[PDB]
């Protein structure tokens, strides 16, 4: 019950991020119009990504498993509060704590992996953690839909409380001027503007105030900075899933089959990434993905049987992330000092999250800009090429992560 408990806590952050793609079913029950009822659901990550460091630090100080006990307990009220009562001002209050739930779990449960294992076992521990995250988030959209169509929107949150219990049953030093920075920084990526120019200021401001209110010169720094750059290519699938479905006029399933082919491939290479192990496999992963992008880029100048070039790309892309993820979850969790893991793990978890947001936003904006100026096929390449640059910068980012 080492991973069996940890995974149960990670999969509490699956059933949270499943309702996000069932936002219309909630529209009926909770009543209030979309935009307000949608942003309500968004709050779960918004608050998670900003608090992860603080909730990691208050786990670092006042007990690791203490905060994993809080998070798993806070996930019960997080779900029970929503599933039971169907009204709007209610939903907001439940999604915000569903977010802090994750902020407590991710860093703390990541620190337990260091204690429980302490080398050699850490390889099998962090690999099981990756399966719990990648595989969990990987289906969350495909899950939430399957549940809402047949069981219901509330029947995805009855699975949240029981798995959160079966997890526990199978086992302010400027924080406020960091969350104000990260609140701003998170909503800056969501660019709906003229007015966002001043919203970039509050980020730069609250950054330098927290900067003058933390002396890492380890390979852990190299792993975190590379992990950020590497997750910048996250847009690749979003821009690909679009191109395939709009440009090549495929159905929803074939798009999902290309995607779930990537999913199983990345899930059966975090295991092989474990055996691969530190710096060597992380260079192979960050490399082979860039070819995986190029393989999906060249399907913008294709033939009739160029579906292969796209397919082999999804595998090439999938397997590369897998070969990088287990070694690089370990290179960080290793050098992270036992005295300060909860704070260190939260930063690695934050850096991973911001990387994805920063990536997708660029990938989308470029695609939306390029496809307007030129066409779908031409525009896709311009967007896919921008993913290559970050993938190469992710391969160059390993240069500052010594053996």
């Amino acid at each position, epitope marked *: 019950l080492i991973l069996g408990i940890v995974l149960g806590v990670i999969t509490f952050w699956l059933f949270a991020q499943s309702l996000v793609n069932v936002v219309p079913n909630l529209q009926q029950s909770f009543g209030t119009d979309m935009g307000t009822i949608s942003i309500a659901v968004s709050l779960t990550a918004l608050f998670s990504g900003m608090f992860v460091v603080g909730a990691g630090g208050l786990a670092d100080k006042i007990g690791r498993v203490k905060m994993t006990n809080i998070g798993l307990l806070l996930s019960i009220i997080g779900s029970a509060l929503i599933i039971i009562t169907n009204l709007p001002a209610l939903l907001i209050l439940g999604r915000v704590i569903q977010g802090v739930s994750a902020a407590c779990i991710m860093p703390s449960t990541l620190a337990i992996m260091k204690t429980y294992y302490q080398g050699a076992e850490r390889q099998r521990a962090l690999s099981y953690w990756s399966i719990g995250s990648w595989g969990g988030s990987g289906i969350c959209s495909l899950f939430g839909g399957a549940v809402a169509t047949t069981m219901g929107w509330r029947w995805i949150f009855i699975f949240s409380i029981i798995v959160a219990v079966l997890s526990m049953l199978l086992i302010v030093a400027g924080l406020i001027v960091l969350v104000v920075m990260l609140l701003s920084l998170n909503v800056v990526i969501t660019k709906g503007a003229l007015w966002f120019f001043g919203l970039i200021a509050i980020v730069i401001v609250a950054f330098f105030i927290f900067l003058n209110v933390l002396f890492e010169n380890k390979p852990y720094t190299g792993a975190t900075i590379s992990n950020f750059l590497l997750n910048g290519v996250a847009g690749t699938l979003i821009v690909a899933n679009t191109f395939v479905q709009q440009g090549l006029g495929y159905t*929803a399933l074939q798009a999902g089959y290309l995607s779930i082919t990537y999913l199983i491939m990345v899930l059966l290479m975090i295991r092989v990434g474990e055996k691969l192990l530190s710096k060597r496999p992380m260079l192979l992963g960050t490399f082979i993905v860039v070819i995986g992008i190029a393989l999906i880029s060249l399907v913008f100048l294709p033939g009739i049987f160029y579906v292969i070039s796209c397919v082999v790309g999804y595998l090439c892309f999938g397997l590369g992330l897998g070969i990088y993820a287990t070694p690089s979850t370990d290179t960080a969790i290793s050098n992270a000092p036992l005295d300060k893991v909860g704070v260190a793990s939260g930063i690695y978890a934050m850096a991973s999250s911001l990387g994805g947001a920063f990536g997708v936003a660029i990938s989308g904006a470029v695609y939306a800009g390029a496809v307007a100026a030129t066409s779908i096929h031409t525009g896709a390449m311009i967007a896919l090429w921008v993913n290559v640059l970050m993938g190469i910068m992710a391969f160059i980012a390993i240069l500052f992560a010594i053996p």
Partner: nanobody
Amino acid sequence: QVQLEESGGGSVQAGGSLRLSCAASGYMYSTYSTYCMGWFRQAPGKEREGVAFIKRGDHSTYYTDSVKGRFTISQDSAKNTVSLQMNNLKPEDTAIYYCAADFAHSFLLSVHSGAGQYSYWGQGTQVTVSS
């Protein structure tokens, strides 16, 4: 930063034909998701009413009782656009036809109709029929 650019419609005699085409610029699909797209009409007197809708993922369509059989919504997949082909029109169909699309959702979830569920709206294309 999505723009529903819509075209077609116009004036015609009763029991005639009028195409209505609409396309969504830079509306990307999530990792396992799609969106629904269709038209709502609103005559100068009557209140807003849904016409025809299609889910872009699996070409799953839905119509209002009024137009059913006469109207046919579909998407010209290679050219990336939804178009409502309206036939045997009657003076009831005379109204401002607004193209709309809802926030992305898992393609598993069923096609949408209710104006509250749809979020993106267009300027509106006029269609009028007479003797």
